[PDB]
Amino acid sequence: STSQVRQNYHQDSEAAINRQINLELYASYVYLSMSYYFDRDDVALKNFAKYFLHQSHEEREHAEKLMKLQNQRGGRIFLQDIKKPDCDDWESGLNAMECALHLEKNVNQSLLELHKLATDKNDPHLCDFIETHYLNEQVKAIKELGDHVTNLRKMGAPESGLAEYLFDKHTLG
Template identity: 35%
Template sequence: MAEPRSKRPRGTLPACQAHRAGPSSRVRHSFPAAVEEGVCGVTSALLELAYCLQALGEYFDQSHVALPNVSKFFLHQALEERKAAEALMKYQQERGGHYCSKTIQKPNCEYAVGLMKALELAMVQWKTMVRYFEELYALSIENADPHSASTIKKQFIGPKIQKIKLMGDLLTNARRLDCSQDGRNSLGDYFMDRLQEEFRTGIEPCLPLQQCTGAAEALKQPPRESSQHRNGIGPICATIHCATMLPQRNGGIGAKVKQGREGL
């Protein structure tokens, strides 16, 4: 028999237990204190994740590792997580709450000295964040806050699930290439850095075949006539200009145009 909803444990949601309610705001409406504490704690967890990804990006940019595309990938992901934390802060302010600043802990990623370890660490971190957001979503439903539940589900849970799928694909390719796990750079690491599409952030991806075909068909179509062409001004001017540039031979186009001008 399942337990009642009210007695189910909260799990591992990093709710801010020391959260202090700010001054009363006129915009605050149906924003439970428990949800505000959960949003505050998840925001700090997002900042810690961004710090961890930034540390991984800086590691792969060192001279003895020399995987610049992998470094750019992790730094870009760190920037996205930081933007997600800022978006959560903005949402909290819109609902009349506030974020209480905390000390961001040092990331525990010293053991991730290889590409395989770094990818596994990133996937574990994103799985943890998805669990936090799912618990926060359930907490919002329990406290009758459908607005927070809808925002968390659409803007945060969905993108994190896509990132987990991305890390799974990268880990599969890394195992195929036998990438290093102990910090010893291998040929597989070099191939992943140079050939993996997700790591090549500086190169724009090619257009799909359908878009390329559509662009080619658009080039084949004749250009649309402007208003000047429709009223007859454009073609006459173009004809006179092109005819005057031709050599005036006997019976040629240039001579006929000249005779026409004299007749006018």
Template identity: 30%
Template structure:
């Protein structure tokens, strides 16, 4: 009886990380829209627009960093698995490339 956990593990991890990156980008877009709103002339709060623009930049940069780290980790994993060509690793690399 074979377990399907091994086969679906990478897909589940990829989906979880993708969800995390999407949440950071969503937060970035939310802060950006709030920043534009508070920069309007008829809104009485000065400086709040700038604050939300800075938060948007931070969240966007964090999302890009997470995506970059994920890609780097995948490249390192590929480099480690390349010398050990097993049927399972070959299928894994085909699925992720």
């Protein structure tokens, strides 16, 4: 029962896109959790909260765009549970930034494995899709998180609550 639209779209690619959909939903969920950590009355860094909420919404958009892709190509979306984040308590602004950096590196590695697969299956439409909409976004995200981690370290986080407060106001404000 093949889709009338399907062309040059390997089953392995189809499956790999479904996995990537789950990973983008998971990254949305991590960032949601981080957001509301910083909204706790005992953490209380509102621009950290807003920053990660925005990232959360971005990752949901990234998921949606892969769902759209799956249907554009005539594959079939298969959803899996979205796992809860590894931590409930993210410790400090610095530790959350470090965790986001690791998350985005993990997501980039997935994307790079997906692009290898697409390359191996000679799917230039999928290669272009990944390159256009995902790989440079990931390089920018990683670089931004790296920059944030550096500033926080240099300022004396996580031990200086002053450092995290002023970063919240100047960089994320």
